[PDB]
Structure 1
Amino acid sequence: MKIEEGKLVIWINGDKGYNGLAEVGKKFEKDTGIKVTVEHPDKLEEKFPQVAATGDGPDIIFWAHDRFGGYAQSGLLAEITPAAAFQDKLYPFTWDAVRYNGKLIAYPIAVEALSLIYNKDLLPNPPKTWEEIPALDKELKAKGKSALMFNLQEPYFTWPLIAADGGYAFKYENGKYDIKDVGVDNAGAKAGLTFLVDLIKNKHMNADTDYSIAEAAFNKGETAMTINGPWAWSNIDTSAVNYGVTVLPTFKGQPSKPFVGVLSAGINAASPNKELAKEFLENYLLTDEGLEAVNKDKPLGAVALKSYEEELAKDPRIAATMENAQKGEIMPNIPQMSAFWYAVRTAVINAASGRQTVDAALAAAQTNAAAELTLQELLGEER
């Protein structure tokens, strides 16, 4: 077999705190003699299905729960079977995030949602509204600061604005998603995205701002506002840029509605170390001890483990996180989510540049994201 027996190889995203995870691995090694290697490869969410398909890859893959339906569907993931006693230690709704066609296909780790993070020193009073940002920008665009910088290359970051006034991915009803009912080219969708483009046609954010550019900018005090997740808080602490975490700005009347991710740990179907990986995840990572260790590197957000969550919930930033979360929506985990995300990332990039109108950018993504009813009936499958 391609995956080596008697070790654990874990893949987790670079923004997440692999050192703290690596530390939980150390404690595992020193107890069990089992070597644990933590890696953070680029384009993890893409690299994994590519190598796992060949029967290779990590024993354990971390990602938000939204990719996992596709992985499970492609046969890349083993069924997760926790004992009732363990299952009961985690919030039921986090288990729900990693249930797919009646089966658990990952361990939920922590609930993630974007918050508005602001420098009090530059803005003791953050705009609680999106519309008062072009005005507040040029106030600093001769100061000479930008008002707002956040990643513009990943639709995850722009999705709150585009969804605030009525955009949505797949319609949820009765416990099921209707893959034919997509809400990407509706009024509120085009609305939030035209607004976003009228921040770049108007020189108030640059079309090509990415995660790197935005994090530095905010952490070197050159912008007073940014949108980012709980993992970002560690590098802000070391920059000492005196910051607060708060409710995202409203667009028109509406709360800005981020897609909510549950960071999740899946077990590679081709791993000969499935029982090992369970041991490691249930008895080392998903413990007050384990999560704290990872959390101290990069904050996880609101952890699935009840006991530790109750400690973390006292934290005002976690309360902010969950306030944004309850205003947002849990991502679906269905296999069509990756196409949805590719279609929306394309539409947002092509409208911030100019190869398409907002209206035609979203017209195309809606088309590529929804299904054709009649051909699907002819084929006899909803795929």
Structure 2
Amino acid sequence: EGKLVIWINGDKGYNGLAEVGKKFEKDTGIKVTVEHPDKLEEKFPQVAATGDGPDIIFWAHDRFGGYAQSGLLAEITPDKAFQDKLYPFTWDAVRYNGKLIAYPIAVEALSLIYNKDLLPNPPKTWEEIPDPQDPRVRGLYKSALMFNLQEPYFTWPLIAADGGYAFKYENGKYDIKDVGVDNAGAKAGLTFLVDLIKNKHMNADTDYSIAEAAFNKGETAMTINGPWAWSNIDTSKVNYGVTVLPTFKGQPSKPFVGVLSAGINAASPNKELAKEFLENYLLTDEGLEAVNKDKPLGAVALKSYEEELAKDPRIAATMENAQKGEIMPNIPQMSAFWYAVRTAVINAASGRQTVDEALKDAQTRITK
């Protein structure tokens, strides 16, 4: 009691938060502890399931419906005046069973970050990446594209591009049995990713870390990452641009828009202290700008603050791609989807399964 323990993934600005935390204490004389586990997404459900853990917790809203259905998260109640400070859509994202289960922090979406000093003009097509059709670049391709291949969230826009989909959205409801993970669209997208690899263009063991170091050092021209990545690049002295993602089979790459939400542990007896921290401190200009400077938020859910930095060009592009992708469901079976697809991508890329056997397997694990 009298001490907030907040969790926030490692790629987010945990140091920005902690600082805001100090601002709390310098006023309320309360200790806020910004920890940031590894796999906090999966630990949380397990630690709070036993009345233990973090007071407050951060994660892209797709994981909240689950926490909710199990009841590890307190129903939040800000007044309608506060609610209006935030764009409507973001509140919709933290809505489960007609009950707000989190505070919206910011909207994020992947983009194509390219090295302006190697590629003054980044491709407009995935199909150009392996075969560029321009002798000016051939002498350049260094690796052309490197991004994390371990998390399915990175491969999704490609798979989605020509028609893949998680759970079918039927105006207000998602038919949780109409899974579009194994179908031409998904097959076509994954097959391409496999060629990129089997055609020496990409390496199956690329994870966030490798791709980041690589693009940052300058040993690859292009990468795909969220707003959080921009920070290290700025302190890597790399000349980069953030643009719309390449189109696959003519259609655009549809990212999966995620809303960084900060919930409250039901098992926590510090709820009135969370509300004030999140409401009067973080969810403000000065507060969000604090977290933000550590590592960029994307389009912050706070209106006033979203507009000021709305003029930032990468925020503009982050919104362009977000605009083409679909915002992700917060239903409980999302977690089943990610685990099922991660595995699917891995075996596909790794060579352990055919594109079809791999995808039909994931599908089935989801519909089972």
Query: TM-score surpassing 0.5?
Result: yes
SS in structure 1 of the partner of residue 197 of structure 2? coil
Preserved contact between residue 113 and residue 240 of structure 2 (Cα < 8 Å): yes
Shift of 1:195: 0.2
Preserved contact between residue 194 and residue 348 of structure 2 (Cα < 8 Å): yes
Runs of 4+ residues deviating >3 angstroms: 135-144
- Are 1:256 and 2:253 matched, yes or no? yes
Query: Which whole-Å deviations, capped at 9, do the CAs of 1:161-182 have from their partners, x for residues lacking one?
Result: 0000000100111211110011
Preserved contact between residue 157 and residue 253 of structure 2 (Cα < 8 Å): yes
Distance of 2:157 and 2:246 partners within structure 1 = 10
SS in structure 2 of the partner of residue 199 of structure 1? helix
Preserved contact between residue 137 and residue 204 of structure 1 (Cα < 8 Å): no
Distance of 2:327 and 2:136 partners within structure 1 = 36
Residue number among 172, 179, 184 corresponding to 1:182 in the alignment: 179
Preserved contact between residue 136 and residue 147 of structure 1 (Cα < 8 Å): no
Shift of 1:74: 1.1
Query: Which whole-Å deviations, capped at 9, do the CAs of 1:282-336 have from their partners, x for residues lacking one?
Result: 0100000110001101000001100000111111110100000010010000000
Shift in CA distance, 106/240, structure 1 to aligned 2, threshold 3 Å: same
Distance of 1:137 and 1:36 partners within structure 2 = 55
Residue number among 161, 164, 169 corresponding to 1:164 in the alignment: 161
User: How many corresponding residue pairs?
Assistant: 364
Distance of 2:297 and 2:133 partners within structure 1 = 32
SS in structure 2 of the partner of residue 313 of structure 1? helix
Preserved contact between residue 138 and residue 204 of structure 1 (Cα < 8 Å): no
Preserved contact between residue 118 and residue 140 of structure 2 (Cα < 8 Å): no
Query: Which is worse superposed, 131-140 or 193-202?
Result: 131-140
Preserved contact between residue 160 and residue 259 of structure 1 (Cα < 8 Å): yes
Distance of 1:271 and 1:137 partners within structure 2 = 59
SS in structure 2 of the partner of residue 24 of structure 1? helix
* Pairwise CA RMSD: 1.5
The 5 A counterparts of 1:233-252 are: 233-252=230-249
Query: Which whole-Å deviations, capped at 9, do the CAs of 1:63-94 have from their partners, x for residues lacking one?
Result: 00000000001111000111111011000100
Distance of 1:356 and 1:138 partners within structure 2 = 35
Distance of 1:120 and 1:61 partners within structure 2 = 37
Preserved contact between residue 182 and residue 360 of structure 2 (Cα < 8 Å): yes
Shift in CA distance, 21/304, structure 1 to aligned 2, threshold 3 Å: same
The 5 A counterparts of 1:2-81 are: 5-81=1-77
The corresponding residue for 1:376 is none
Query: Which whole-Å deviations, capped at 9, do the CAs of 1:198-217 have from their partners, x for residues lacking one?
Result: 01111111001000000000
Q: Which runs of 5+ in 2 are unaligned?
A: none
Shift of 1:137: 11
Q: Which runs of 5+ in 1 are unaligned?
A: 368-382
Preserved contact between residue 140 and residue 146 of structure 1 (Cα < 8 Å): no
Identity %: 96
Distance of 1:149 and 1:333 partners within structure 2 = 29
Shift in CA distance, 169/137, structure 1 to aligned 2, threshold 3 Å: farther
Shift in CA distance, 39/33, structure 1 to aligned 2, threshold 3 Å: same
Query: Which whole-Å deviations, capped at 9, do the CAs of 1:4-45 have from their partners, x for residues lacking one?
Result: x11100000000010000110000011000001001110110
Shift of 1:355: 1.4
Residue number among 285, 289, 298 corresponding to 2:282 in the alignment: 285
